[PDB]
DNA sequence: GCATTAATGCATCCGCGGCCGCCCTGGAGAATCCCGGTGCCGAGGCCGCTCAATTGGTCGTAGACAGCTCTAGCACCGCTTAAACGCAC
DNA sequence: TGCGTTTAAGCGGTGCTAGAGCTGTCTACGACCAATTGAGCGGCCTCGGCACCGGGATTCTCCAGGGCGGCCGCGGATGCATTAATGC
């Protein structure tokens, strides 16, 4: 995870980041730092709670 | 040619990391179930809260780190590095037990 | 032929003699002189009772003998019979000093 | 037909040589320090409450002040052993 | 550990006086209670300090190639043994 984030902040190394449901709930601290344009949920019946 | 650290090199860095850090080194649930079962035999139907456990935890690991420190002193006095049984036996005997 | 005991054999018999004896090993005059010197460099024109001296020497010989078995245990831990400086220093450090 | 004697298949004992591992020097890679960078959350300044510290008076009470009493600490004297010190193996 | 000696405590006894110990007395001096108000305290909501990770400069450890004196595979001899054509 740190290896994937070694070029995470400064350059535009990726135009889209694909993350699992249960990894955001662990890396919120790193995720909320970056600014995003489009964020999409798949099968939102899980997040219906 | 894989890069392997020689034995004892990482020990110094774990010591450095742990000496600057003051967090509990014992998992919470094993400690709390240990406390519950040892309080069982004295008298049944115990009740423990979120507090009244961390105090025991902290007293315990402070006592244990002090014991490890003077065990290190005794082992150094034995002109060796590896700890052994009689080290903790005479540390306990000398400290007042 | 001369009758000379092997070295250390007299040590066991003198240990036996001294263990059954509860008398003090310090002469009264040197002890009193030392205590009076502590008073002299402590506070000028001090008076000493006939009592309040037995407690001094008694506590001293108790402390000395105690520290002596601690240093003896430390020495025997070192796999040697003769005591040394590190033995007494380690005993003092572990006892609480 | 039998010994026999030169031709022949190895016999096993070295001669030689193919056979490496250690120090010193060549940088190479992981770990650390350190503040931006932003999100988080609780420290505390402010608002409203309330209860006991302060004030004064009443009143009785324990301790400094002698005051005295007596008492053992000490400085001193001289005898009797008695361990301590220096030495040597 | 063992010995000659010498510096020295242990001991019997005295005269005292600085000092420990028990006792009236009053005189400071606090124990206790109306009465108040004012500081300590319960609650709250926010922004600035803090938590945690990123990017490089820096600092630390650790890898391998190369020049140092001894090597264990091999080949042949040339003896031990075998063997077949021939004189007897």
Swiss-Prot record, chain A:
Residue numbers covered by motif DEAH box: 42-45
Subcellular location: Nucleus
Subunit structure, interactors included: Component of the SWR1 chromatin-remodeling complex composed of at least ACT1, ARP4, RVB1, RVB2, ARP6, YAF9, VPS71, VPS72, SWC3, SWC4, SWC5, SWC7 and SWR1, and perhaps BDF1.
Entry function: Catalytic component of the SWR1 complex which mediates the ATP-dependent exchange of histone H2A for the H2A variant HZT1 leading to transcriptional regulation of selected genes by chromatin remodeling.
Other known facts: Present with 656 molecules/cell in log phase SD medium.
Family: Belongs to the SNF2/RAD54 helicase family. SWR1 subfamily.
Protein name, UniProt field: Helicase SWR1
UniProt gene name: SWR1
UniProtKB/Swiss-Prot annotation, chains B, C:
N6,N6,N6-trimethyllysine: residues carrying this PTM: 43
Keyword presence, S-adenosyl-L-methionine: no
N6-malonyllysine: residues carrying this PTM: 20
Post-translational modification N6-methyllysine, affected residues: 1, 43
Gene Ontology biological process terms in this record: aerobic respiration; chromatin organization; global genome nucleotide-excision repair; intracellular copper ion homeostasis; nucleolar large rRNA transcription by RNA polymerase I; positive regulation of transcription by RNA polymerase I; regulation of DNA-templated transcription; rRNA transcription
Modification sites for N6,N6-dimethyllysine: 43
Post-translational modification: Phosphorylated by IPL1 to form H3S10ph in a cell cycle-dependent manner during mitosis and meiosis. H3S10ph is also formed by SNF1, promotes subsequent H3K14ac formation by GCN5, and is required for transcriptional activation through TBP recruitment to the promoters. Dephosphorylation is performed by GLC7.
Sequence positions bearing N6-propionyllysine: 20
Principal cellular location given in the protein's record: nucleus
PTM annotation (N6-succinyllysine): residues: 43
Molecular-function GO terms, alphabetical: cupric reductase (NADH) activity; DNA binding; protein heterodimerization activity; structural constituent of chromatin
Mutagenesis or variant effect for residue 20 to A/Q/R: Increases sensitivity to genotoxic agents inducing DNA breaks during replication
Positions of modified residues (N6-acetyllysine): 1, 20, 28
GO cellular component: a single term: nucleosome
Keyword tags: Acetylation, Chromosome, DNA-binding, Methylation, Nucleosome core, Nucleus, Phosphoprotein
Compartments it resides in: Nucleus; Chromosome
Keyword Phosphoprotein: yes
Annotated family: Belongs to the histone H3 family.
Further remarks about this protein from its record: Present with 213000 molecules/cell in log phase SD medium.
Assembly with partners or alone: The nucleosome is a histone octamer containing two molecules each of H2A, H2B, H3 and H4 assembled in one H3-H4 heterotetramer and two H2A-H2B heterodimers. The octamer wraps approximately 147 bp of DNA. Histone H3 is a component of the UAF (upstream activation factor) complex, which consists of UAF30, RRN5, RRN9, RRN10, and histones H3 and H4.
Function of the protein: Core component of nucleosome. Nucleosomes wrap and compact DNA into chromatin, limiting DNA accessibility to the cellular machineries which require DNA as a template. Histones thereby play a central role in transcription regulation, DNA repair, DNA replication and chromosomal stability. DNA accessibility is regulated via a complex set of post-translational modifications of histones, also called histone code, and nucleosome remodeling.
Protein name stated in the entry: Histone H3
Organism field: Saccharomyces cerevisiae (strain ATCC 204508 / S288c)
């Amino acid at each position: 995870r740190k290896e994937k984030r070694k070029g995470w902040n400064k350059p535009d190394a990726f135009h889209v980041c694909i993350v699992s449901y249960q990894l955001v709930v662990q890396d919120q601290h790193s995720f909320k730092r970056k600014r995003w344009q489009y964020m999409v949920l798949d099968e939102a019946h899980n997040i219906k709670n | 040619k894989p890069h392997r650290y020689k034995p004892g090199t990482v020990a110094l860095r774990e010591i450095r990391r742990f000496q600057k850090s003051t967090e509990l080194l014992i998992r919470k649930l094993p400690f709390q179930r240990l406390v519950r079962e040892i309080a069982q035999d004295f008298k049944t139907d115990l009740r423990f809260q979120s507090s009244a456990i961390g105090a025991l935890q902290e007293s315990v690991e402070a006592y244990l780190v002090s014991l490890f420190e003077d065990t290190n002193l005794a082992a150094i006095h034995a002109k060796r590095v590896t700890i052994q049984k009689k080290e903790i036996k005479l540390a306990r005997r000398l400290r007042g037990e």
